């Protein structure tokens, strides 16, 4: 019981506005773990590593998830803050990608040894369904206190 | 109400572990297909750019065997360029629907045109199996995690904390 069509003219000014529209629909629809996102990290050799974590909060400063601060991710993040997030909503032909730096949350907002990270929003991509296979893709690049928007290839 | 019905499981013990991690992987994939999950072969591939920034995108698994996992891409797409500059990659099958995840770590090598033949310039890469991790759903949030590390033509196996 479907969805098809993502053209430049449905694009909101704040990407978080399109994100929320997609996250509700995911929860509206069946989709198990609407908030599950795959976070990628890179260790000191250049190797990426992946694992799912749940999105707990989000606003313009970034996306937040919690984790044990002594696990492979926390350790990798501390040597490399560059991470990537991907909401795998392929049940609805969708995908949301977020590139950004993982700053360690304060010991304040977490209210031991168990904290969380906030991933800033430097880029956010939206990939959408495709009857035929004309994948709609739109990238939001954070530029100069503004969002530079672009259409990409399928 | 269900003609094809449904079902789920629990308990990933060290005893039931096969000698070859691809036997367990084959079991979870059959089990993903049986429970009519969406795109059971969908996996998230993660590459890294020259600056050390990771990128991620869903790709579909087209074949696997002891040499590695295969997927197809266009040869002039961002992930293709990132691999040519850095073959290190991660694959993660997002089977949360079933409380599972599988992570594969290895190097992605371009397949010979002969390989691409099995099933613009659409090509294929094969990720080797240097590590494969398994994550299952144990009761009280107390999860089961196993890592298969490839070492000297064999597999070192170790449980991990949740
Ligand atoms: C649906 C689902 C939700 C999960 N949520 C979290 C979470 O919010 N934080 C976390 O650290 N791990 C979470 N995990 C476990 C991770 O996948 C991972 O095993 C763990 O964080 C340690 O990984 P690392 O050793 O790569 O650091 C979740 C797993 C699944 C399948
Ligand atoms: C269920 C599903 C399956 C997909 N399968 C493939 C695939 O097998 N190969 C591929 O190159 N892109 C596939 N895509 C699209 C990619 O995720 C992505 O848009 C594209 O290849 C991005 O490549 P780039 O990061 O190399 O620019 C799929 C998306 C979904 C939701």
UniProtKB/Swiss-Prot annotation, chain A:
Transmembrane segments: none annotated. Catalyzes the oxidation of either pyridoxine 5'-phosphate (PNP) or pyridoxamine 5'-phosphate (PMP) into pyridoxal 5'-phosphate (PLP). This is Pyridoxine/pyridoxamine 5'-phosphate oxidase. Belongs to the pyridoxamine 5'-phosphate oxidase family. It is an enzyme of class 1 (oxidoreductase). SUPFAM superfamilies: FMN-binding split barrel (SSF50475). One of its GO terms (biological process) is pyridoxine biosynthetic process. Gene3D superfamilies: Electron Transport, Fmn-binding Protein, Chain A. Its EC number is 1.4.3.5. Its cofactor is FMN. FMN binds at residues 51-56, 66-67, 72-73, 95, 127, 137. Keywords: Flavoprotein, FMN, Oxidoreductase, Pyridoxine biosynthesis. It comes from Shigella flexneri. The keyword Flavoprotein applies. Pathway: Cofactor metabolism; pyridoxal 5'-phosphate salvage; pyridoxal 5'-phosphate from pyridoxamine 5'-phosphate: step 1/1; Cofactor metabolism; pyridoxal 5'-phosphate salvage; pyridoxal 5'-phosphate from pyridoxine 5'-phosphate: step 1/1. The keyword Nucleotide-binding does not apply.
């Amino acid at each position: 019981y479907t969805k098809g069509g993502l053209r430049r003219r449905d694009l909101p000014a704040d990407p978080l506005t399109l994100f929320e529209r997609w996250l509700s629909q995911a929860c509206e629809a069946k989709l198990a773990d609407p908030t599950a996102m795959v976070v990628a990290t890179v260790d000191e050799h250049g190797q990426p590593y992946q694992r799912i974590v749940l999105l707990k909060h989000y606003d313009e400063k970034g996306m937040v998830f919690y984790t044990n601060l002594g696990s492979r991710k926390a350790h990798q993040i501390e040597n490399n803050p560059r991470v990537s997030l991907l909401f795998p909503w392929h049940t609805l032909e969708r995908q949301v990608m977020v590139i950004g730096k993982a700053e360690r949350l304060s010991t304040l907002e977490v209210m031991s040894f168990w904290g969380g990270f906030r991933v800033s929003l430097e880029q956010i991509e939206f990939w959408q369904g495709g009857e035929h296979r004309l994948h709609d893709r739109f990238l939001y690049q954070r530029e100069n206190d503004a969002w530079k928007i672009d259409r990409l290839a399928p």
